[model samples]
Target chain A: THLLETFEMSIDHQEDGLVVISMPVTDKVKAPFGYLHGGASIALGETACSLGSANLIDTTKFIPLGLEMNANHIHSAKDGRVTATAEIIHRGKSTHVWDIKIKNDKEQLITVMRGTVAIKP
Target chain B: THLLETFEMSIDHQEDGLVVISMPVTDKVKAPFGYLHGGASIALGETACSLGSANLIDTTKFIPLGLEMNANHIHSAKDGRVTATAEIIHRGKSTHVWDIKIKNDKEQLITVMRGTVAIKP
Candidate 1:
């Protein structure tokens, strides 16, 4: 269950349909250019959005599957952890939309990602 | 110039304004999920498009910067290299568009990506 556990990311707060999660930027997740890898950032973003959407769904019997996701790297991070905060853009019976923003320790926006998850009943 | 060289990917053929490049997928490039990293696919797509556009431009003084890129993952692969083929959709003086397809060794499309690059005059 480590695959699910690795993505068992935590939420710092949830209010007004907004969910905030924190992730550390470590050497293990860096790219060859010494910056945070875009894939890792994307995984974090998808994880945050998926978890957030699940929190608002019937978690007892429903599972969320990420259908599509995209990230825009606005800035670069080298040596600090980043926090991903997600806000639900839309919530439906079968689909969910989320906008996630990742910011560095200095609170600078490093990346912006959007995700669509399908709710399986 | 290795950075440039790393992206200097070879073209197997350039016919009808289509460019093809070969890339090896090694263990070092695998993600935790044992598939090609999306960012790498993205990088290859962008590189192919940029290079293809550069080939059509006056490279004597022009430089291309990737403006945006998007990819859709269709299939997965392991233990095999992939080939990326790029074709220009539009080639203007200031902007260029390309559609790139990444296929695994079995010739199955692993990912489809599109990129836009701005040519600096």
Candidate 2:
């Protein structure tokens, strides 16, 4: 959980088929130019989606592994916390697809991500 | 630089339109399953592509920001170092595109990534 601890990320909210995670714009998650790094946003989105999948399956029987992920950075976040909201797209027995949206503190869209997780036994 | 420092990442090699970066598979980059996290591989690829763009552009006038990125995780690594090799696909005045290939210590392909960077003044 170093990625979570290092970035100061936490699960802000969670419910059936949805999860929301937040990470502060600290130096650990900032680019050299002083804005939130796109990779950090991507990581946050992946975390949200992966956690979402975890909620749908039995952890003792199957493990959800990230298979593929894509993201488009729409805006930059300079300060405060960036939040990622993830919802299930396609939930099958073998794979789960997720759509994640990230927003800055002002509710400006920061990035949109789609991720797929493979359920392995 | 926190990303680089926190992950123990370093530039292994660099040249025109190409860069190689290496990161260790320490606890910092591991997932809950004791393997490399897909997000860490994406982050490493992004760093390699961003650095490759930096090599082609004039840093004083333009800043290369990640606009879009996608990755397919083919395999997972548990130990040793993972290396990301990046090559430019397109170099434009306003945008740059790159293809990144990541490999584990055994030289097996772990992931393939394509990233686009926006050059902003």
Candidate 3:
């Protein structure tokens, strides 16, 4: 909640195996060069995947922790908002892999990332 | 400034091609489960690399922006502080590659990441 609140992120949509999260492209998420920070985009994608993994596991019995991530910044977003949509690519007993696409308000791809979450008891 | 202020991050040490950035493992950087958020670690790494890249380029003519990143979260830190050390692995005319390692106060490996920064005119 601190991370989300710090960046003014919201869980816009969430269902069985999908999660859609959005964050404003404010100074809080901008680089010194005045564009969206790639790390913020990475964080947004990880948030979507981690939350999605949480939905699939029992929180009382296990915790979903982000283990690895790979990200590519295709386009830069200067203003408006960025949305991250996450989908499960692999659902294993101990790990879950996710593919996340972050798009700007104009529906242009900003960052694409794949992350893996480890389920720990 | 926004991201650094948001996370209470500081550039502890910096040289020509190396940078050391530090951030406390506070609520603002913690996950829902109360451990260090992987995204925060990734952000710290990128910040180090981007700043390190900035030192090597002329800001007036070229802007250094993060292009890609790969992160592996090894261990989680609950409290105290985490530091990221970044070193340039490859310096090209248009792109720079960096290797970053995040460690906890006890010198335990927390995360390892490699990031690329693109210099654009």
Winning candidate number (DockQ): 3
Candidate 3 clashing pairs?
Answer: none
Candidate 2 residue spans exceeding 4 A from truth: none
Candidate 1 per-residue lDDT over residues A44-100, each given as its tens digit: 676677677778888789976666667666677776677789999999889988898
Q: Looking at model 3 chain A, which ten-residue stretch has the lowest summed lDDT?
A: A28-37
Error in Å for residue A46 of model 2: 0.8
Task: Put down candidate 3 lDDT per residue, B1-121, tens digits, no spaces.
Answer: 8777777889999999899999999988887778888888999999999899999999889888788999999988999999999999999999999999999989999999999999999
RMSD (Cα, Å) for all candidates, in order, is 5.7, 1.2, 1.2
Candidate DockQ values, in order, are 0.13, 0.70, 0.78
The alpha-carbon lDDT assigned to residue B76 of candidate 3 equals 80
Candidate order by decreasing DockQ: 3, 2, 1
Better of 1 and 2 by lDDT: 2
Superposition error at A60 for model 3 (Å): 2.4
Question: How well does candidate 1 reproduce the true complex, by DockQ?
Answer: 0.13
Worst 10 residues of 2 chain B by lDDT: B27-36
Query: How many residue pairs clash in each candidate at the backbone level?
Result: 0, 0, 0
Supply the TM-score for candidate 3. Answer: 0.96
